[PDB]
Amino acid sequence: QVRPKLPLLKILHAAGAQGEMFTVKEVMHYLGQYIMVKQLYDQQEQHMVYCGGDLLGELLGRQSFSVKDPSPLYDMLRKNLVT
Amino acid sequence: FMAFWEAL
């Protein structure tokens, strides 16, 4: 299990997560929930996420990313999860 | 979206 740093934890809480400690797969689940709540994916190209001007974009250091490429997400998790 | 997200 992992404990997210605060900005990432606030994203998880916005999407319904409770508490401070999670499995990696729970973190990934709640990131997906957040993207759906905030409607960040392109309805017409649903693997593309446009996160510019969202806290998620700040954490990723990205304006957009493809869900098909896990690399920017993994990089962010390495920096934002404490084990 | 979900089909793709679950594949990460």
Structural domains present in chain A: 1-83 (1.10.245.10)
Residues on chain A touching B6 (C-beta within 8 angstroms): 32
For residue A43, the one-letter residue type is Q
A44: left (phi over 0), alpha (psi -120 to 50) or beta: alpha
Count of beta carbons in the 10 Å neighbourhood of residue A37:
12
Phi, psi dihedrals of residue A82, rounded to the nearest 5°: -115, 130
Residues on chain B touching A28 (C-beta within 8 angstroms): 8
Instruction: Note whether A45 contacts B: Cβ–Cβ < 8 A.
Output: no
Phi, psi dihedrals of residue A79, rounded to the nearest 5°: -85, -20
> What is the distance in angstroms between the Cα of A20 and the nearest Cα belonging to chain B?
23
HSE-CB of A2 using CA atoms within 13 angstroms: 18
Resolution (A): 1.3
Tokens found for residue A64: 């957009």
- Structure determined via: X-ray
- For tokens 């990089």, name the residue: A75
